[model samples]
Target chain A: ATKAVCVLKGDGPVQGTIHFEAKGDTVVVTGSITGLTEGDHGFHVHQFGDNTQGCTSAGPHFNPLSKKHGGPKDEERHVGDLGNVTADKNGVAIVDIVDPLISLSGEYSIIGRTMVVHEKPDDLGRGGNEESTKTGNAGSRLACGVIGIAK
Target chain B: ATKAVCVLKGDGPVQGTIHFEAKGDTVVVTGSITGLTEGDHGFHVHQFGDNTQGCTSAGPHFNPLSKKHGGPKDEERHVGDLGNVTADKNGVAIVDIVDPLISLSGEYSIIGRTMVVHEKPDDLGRGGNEESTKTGNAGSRLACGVIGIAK
Candidate 1:
């Protein structure tokens, strides 16, 4: 069990659907996004589902452990740090990945939080700057959706 | 597309998932629930997803047009009037329904709201009682979950 889904949307042309399926200690993340540029986009889960102020009110990456901003594979990354999802030449991104820090139920569950797509590529802390460690220097929030409890 | 889902949960053993798929002016509802007493139970979409005070804080049924409580097929009924869901002998209820009042991304969007399961069969305003018109005389809220945007 422990399955969830989010139908993405934005004020602009960005729109898509993302799925979260639990598999024991990890979760499989899959979906597709459209209206993105032909490159990488910072994709991560934010702290709130409050979209009243666009995705800005959703807040920073979900760092329940107060960890550093590292890549998804890093040892000190935030739980919501999903790294980048790249878009093809036709302005679409096919997402398929697995994350170990996500939980659909129990403590630190991501249910009710917002999943966001960024306007820039996440540096994954390799930039060695303050913003690099804070946000991977991911630019503005482009598209977002609330992660919900699902069948 | 405007699809959504809710993973049902409660303080007790009740658990399940509900799906909402938009189709033109109507939406399809499908799901399954477990842990009941083998009878009818009221089901409706409340106004808020607030669960801090359990399902009670979810508030009254989502009546955007200020319609009175009625049966699901009534000519005038609250948008959230889903009537009752019957449980089988094994305490399982298979849900497959369609309603014209639900919306996923419009003025009456049900996203971020809570879907509740009641403790008693909904009277559908047929009891000739005050509670029947307001709450269908449905007993206590047993379980609930937030309707979240979904893939």
Candidate 2:
């Protein structure tokens, strides 16, 4: 199986690692993040791999398909829209999800890109605002890292 | 233990994955690379994780310690100096080395960096050329990828 890993880095106390493994036709994303507010945070794969200016340099959601922003399960959505990750009472969040649109190879590959966690919820493109359809109104970027190939 | 992974990419046939795992004070690096000429090639950890320009954007050797370039066995070498990796007749190179200078934390941390394989062998600061001290006279970057945290 092919896989990718990201070393999450950001301001404040937000920090952690995320792992993406290709299993069958889907890419299984799993990991744990700590030091976040006890609530939901928007998570996605940004277009650029650059973290030179931190998360801001990563650009917008990965939309090579030119699709609109939506939830992970939505039939029409940006390739990056993976919904939200919720932190627990202890300010920790464990992520485990299988994405059918993501992969380690080909055009939809998430490799050499940026993974970001936003300060607010994603709204899954249902917030009834222009930003919702564009960015899911995910607010500011909290943490970010580049996706690299893994053994 | 903490770990990092790299997916080597280049225009040539060079392609593979390198794994770095933290054990005690050092990091145990192990992996296999395929599609190379049957000879020795320079391998190193680069300063930047950026790969927008492919391997060229990875920048110089990872020298957080500000040391000169040398072989992996040298005590006064750049933290990135991992020495040569020889490919077998089958065009596969198996890397297995323990580095005492690299770490996942502290000032010498290698996380958020880049791993690179060179087209030529690193002279290990022994070649009396001007570039030897700075880059070990290692030729163009052959394969490159970002180093990312792994589970």
Candidate 3:
């Protein structure tokens, strides 16, 4: 089944809806996000869908295999590492992405997880900072939502 | 306390962040919405924080008392009817309005409810039709979010 994650501003000034569709091992992510600054913002799937502590409960990226943080194009990157989305001067990002690592089913299935947008750009583990290898240096969570099956 | 409601694209293509602040009885509302068609769309508060059930559980506008569906400026209007937000050519709506009827506290408190965006402009309950006085005939539910405390 296709999935839709409705990320909201339960935290800071960020909110939007994201759609995830899986075709075998390939996944397509698309949607529009608002309330962002004019720059790149980290966008990734999280390990949990829990909102008990707001977006904080979303935990880390969907790195089920214990991989280091890297870009979406990196051969060895976190399954949730979607890299970043750039917002324009009007504070909106029109997203369209095709991914090969994440999926809606199977071992690394993203179902029942969470999608998060970060305050800073992901360095893709190239920043040489401690956090870079961990979270691609992505900053605080700006918005998030749980992944749910959509009929 | 300031409040933020993260409306998401639970249905059609629309999502954004909304801010609400209370100063006595007056409430200030502001936000930015994206992924809308080039035109005016109805925006309002719903009767439930349940931004779920495929956006159907939002029930109608948050009309606590007996009031006809009308514009925000109208005295005999639903408290939820704040009128329409127009999206520009770039499919973004810059929302900013000081609502006098809606408040963040009191008997008509909108806390824990839902915010919704519609597919069409609100006729202000004067579209000379049956549905106008009710749903304002604003068409389908495009996006929704549960209102929550900002702090």
Candidate 4:
């Protein structure tokens, strides 16, 4: 199976981690995270760009299908916008989700795309708010890293 | 936790992936990558200074301890320098390691640090064609982004 790893550093030591793998039947993502403010933060796959240009350099969210920006589990939402992670005040989070759109052994996967965490929580489906059009949960750009398959 | 996700673009899609997390006992890191061009690539955690500065914009590798340039496992190595990831004709790689210094529950998560990928690789232990004393095995800066933790 193909694999990729990332190390994150922010205001503290270790914040979170993600393991992306490509199995025979499905793309498996497994791992645990910690060091959060205790809430849900927006998570998504971002299109890659020349970051030498700055944050805008990263380009828009990874939406190969031209889907609009939406939360995770949104069938029609952007391919990389996988919603947010929920943590407790202790800053501990564990994730085990599956998405058939990506895989480790396929001809193509979401490895090249960027993973992002927003400052606020995504509204999920809650509309009628200021940031409702997008993930009402807007925040600063915290961590980022590239995806690679296992050797 | 406060997360900061980011992305970086280059000549093509990033063919690599990195994983980082805080387990109950220790911090774990893993990476699976492919599509590289038969060589070594430098990787590290960069200080936030806006990629607008281009290569120099990323600032020096995270070296809070003021240690000299070294490899990922070197005790005196700079905190930012995680060394390099090698690739073959098909460009595939994977890694799984543990570190006691990392802790998501503590400080130093991916909330603000920028993860940079260089076009070349770092020469661990120094004494190569790339000046082991200065940048160690690293060649030059190619792409970078902020490492973020998910809430």
DockQ for each model: 0.07, 0.08, 0.03, 0.04
Name the lDDT value of residue B143 in candidate 3: 86
Ranking by lDDT: 2, 1, 3, 4
How would you encode candidate 1's per-residue C-alpha lDDT over A13-70 as one tens digit per residue? 9988888889878889898999999788999898766554467767888887898897
Q: After superposition, how far is residue B127 of candidate 4 from its true place, in Å?
A: 16
Model 2, A20-125: lDDT tens digits are 8898789999998887887889999986655544577678888987879999999989999898999999969999989999886656767667799998898999
Which 10-residue span in candidate 3 chain A carries the lowest summed lDDT?
A1-10
Stretches of candidate 2 above 4 Å error?
Answer: B1-113, B116-121, B124-151
C-alpha TM-score for every candidate = 0.56, 0.57, 0.52, 0.47
Residue-wise C-alpha lDDT for candidate 4, range A75-126, written one tens digit per residue: 6666666677777778676767677665434223454345556566766635
Per-model clash counts, in order, read: 0, 0, 0, 58
lDDT of 2 at A134: 84
Error of 2 at A58 (Å): 0.4
Backbone clash pairs in model 3 (N, Cα, C under 3 Å; residues 3+ apart or in different chains), count: 0
Model 2: per-residue Cα lDDT over B95-118, one tens digit each: 999988887663566655688888
lDDT of each prediction vs. the true structure? 0.79, 0.80, 0.74, 0.55
- Give the Cα-based TM-score of candidate 3 against the true structure: 0.52
Where is the poorest 10-residue window by lDDT in model 1 chain B? B48-57
The deviation in Å at residue B84 for candidate 3 is 0.1
lDDT of 2 at B11: 88
